[PDB]
Every structure is written in C-alpha cells, then in structure tokens.
C-alpha cells in the first residue's frame, strides 16, 4: 500500500483539503478490502485457518477441547480427593513436592492407576 503522501501527490487538479482526506480514507478501505479477499483465498483450505473460522471445524475443536479439558478436570478432582496437594504450598522450599505432584498429574492425564505412581516414591 502507498501512504497518504503519495496518494495526494497523484491528484493535482481538484486539489482540496476536505476531498483529499476523504478519498485517502476511502482508498485505505478499498485496499484493505482487497487484502482480506486475497488473504481469504490465499489460506482458504489450510487446516489452521479452517479450524479458527470454518463452522464445521470450529464445532469439532470445541468438542475436542471440552473432552480433553473434562479429562484434565478429573485429574485435578482426583488429585484433590487423593490429596497430592494436601500438604503442598507453591514455594521454593516445597519445590520437590511440586515436581513429583506434576509427574503424578501427567500419569493421571495419560490414565495410569495408583500402581503406576509407585516409581516416584
């Protein structure tokens, strides 16, 4: 895109201040209209762009997210009632407990039983 200096310079006949600022602000939008229509057709069928904006794929990622998240909740709710952060404070003094707790969380995220956690002891 060409800046305000350049567009005014290419109109040396009907040279008004009121008309110049209107036509440049119209040109701005006239150009940015083109860029969006170019960009849409440029990245039309790409999965990242499809997923963010296309109704069918937008619905899928929400369902995929909710299901993966609900499983991450179950882990927190398991760590609560198991009490993996029963005596745990987010402090550098209690750093080794956090790292062990996170590893215990990841195992539950994958879906391992209490027998799987025994290696951390």
């Amino acid at each position: 895109m060409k800046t305000f200096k350049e567009f005014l310079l290419s109109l040396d006949d009907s040279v008004d201040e009121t008309e110049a600022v209107k036509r440049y602000n119209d040109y701005k939008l006239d150009f940015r209209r083109q860029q969006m229509q170019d960009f849409f057709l440029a990245h039309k069928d790409e999965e990242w762009f499809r997923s963010k904006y296309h109704p069918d794929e937008v619905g899928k990622r929400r369902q995929e997210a909710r299901g993966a998240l609900q499983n991450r909740l179950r882990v927190f709710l398991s760590l609560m009632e198991t009490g993996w952060f029963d005596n745990l404070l987010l402090d550098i003094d209690k750093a080794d407990a956090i790292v062990k707790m996170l590893d215990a969380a990841v195992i539950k995220m994958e879906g391992g039983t209490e027998n799987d956690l025994r290696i951390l002891e």
């Binding site: 969006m36 999965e47 760590l79 609560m80 952060f85 996170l102 956690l117 290696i119």
Partner: protein, 316 residues
Amino acid sequence: PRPLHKTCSLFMRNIAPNISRAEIISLCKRYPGFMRVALSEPQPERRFFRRGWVTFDRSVNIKEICWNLQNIRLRECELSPGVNRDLTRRVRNINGITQHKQIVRNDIKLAAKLIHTLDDRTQLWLPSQNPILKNITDYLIEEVSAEEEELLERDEKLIKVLDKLLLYLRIVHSLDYYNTCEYPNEDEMPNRCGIIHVRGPMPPNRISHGEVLEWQKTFEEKLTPLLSVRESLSEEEAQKMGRKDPEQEVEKFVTSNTQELGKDKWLCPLSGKKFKGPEFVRKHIFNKHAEKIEEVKKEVAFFNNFLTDAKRPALP
C-alpha cells in the same frame, strides 16, 4: 509400574501451513510407540510457517527415529527433525513480595475472576456452579460468638486457599498464574505440565507502602490480556469491509446454475436435467440438491467469521 510421566520427542522447524495434522500423524504412526503430534501457531513473519512436536513413548529410542526422518519431506517441504531434550528448570522463581497479606487476598480475588471467566468461556459447569468457588467462599471468615460476649508477611490460611485456585488454573486451564501466561497447546505437547512459576524466597527490606500497590497494578495490567474476548468490529465496519449476506448470495447460486439453452428450456449443471421454465429449475435445486444450498451458507459464514475478527492474521 509404568513411567508415563516421561515421554521423549522430536521437534521440527518451519512446517508449511498447507500441511495438516492428519498427514503428519500418518507419517509418524507406523513407528512403534507413537503417541501424539502438536503444532504451534503459524507466525506471520515467517509466512505462517508452523513448529511441530511429535511425541513418543519413552521406552522406544528417539535418536534412530530422528535419523530415519532426517532427510524426508512432506507435501511440498523438507522437515529435517531434531531430538527435543527434556525440560531443565521447571519450578521457577518470581518476586518474593507475592507472599503477603494484602497481595494474596487480591491474588484470590483475581484467581476467582480468572476461574469464573475461564469456566464460563470453556463451557464447563448465572453464577458459577464450580465447587472450589462455592466451598472456598464459605471459608476466609471470622467466626465468633460476640453476641454471647455482649450479653454476658505471611498468612498461610489465605495461601492454602490460593493454592487450590492456582493449581486448578494451572492443571485444568493450563494458566501459569505467577508468570501471567497460558500454555494453550500444552495437552498435545511432549510435556503436559512443564514450567510452573512459584513464590520467591524472602523480601529482604521492609515491605514498602506503595510498592504493594505498584506490584498489583503491574500484575493486573498483565492479566487483563488473558481475559479479553475476540474483538468484533462494528456492524457498519463489518458490512463496509465486506460481509456477505447469506440469503442474498444463495439466490446468486440458484440463478447462475439455472442456465437457458432456448425458449422455455432451462438446464442446470448440478444434475444434467432440463426443465420447461425458470421456476421448475429453482424447485429442482432446493428439493433434490439440499447439500449445496447449505454448502454455500457455510462458506458464506466461513468468510464472514474471518471479517468479524478485528485482530486477524495478515502479512506485515
């Protein structure tokens, strides 16, 4: 006993945007002990090129598998993977001022709002019916029999309350509180809960009177980006920029299909069937080819959805 907490992995720089998950998955699926693939946000400065992490079972070795993919290409570009080593410094430090009476109380106020927003936004659980927001709000109370008497620096109570919110925010929503950042893709990435930021050691000096207010103004100003909704433009500007009407552009599909070969003889190229007038071809497309009329509406909404967003992807 299984070591499921450990998982070794590959890393790939400069993956193309036309490449999807599906076809990276199929490339790595026929290896043994394959788990999952995770791609990052495509950055505009590199022409929207992604960064991938293929994660494996920790038993099966990575260095041979990285070599077996070392000079392989997908779609229209060459991958050249590298071995992604494990995370070094997990439990990181921040300011020691955060272990304070007034500051923890505000951290609990913020953490409540974060969960209130994120729960509603993600569509888990109009007051929030999450148990840790009800059950914790019951606590943080003085309870005394003052009526019966009338007639006759750390605060670990609040910190132990804060930890339950912060650990929920970190574990459930992948939100590192003390760093003030999300890990959005994290659940697919090799390490499911890597970096976590934690309260500092001590505050050496006397805790300054305005410095507690200054910390919160810096801290809350950084948290405000994390709560922000997708910035939709004004319904003028969306229409000006070029919002397509659904019913209008559906009419454009029907008429442009309904071609004329002669006098009272109309064909459409969505079947190969000729009719006696322009009215007969309209009822043919609506009734028999209901799949296409939705397909137009969907791709109109697809283009609209892009225009709706103010903070879009574009070339710098």
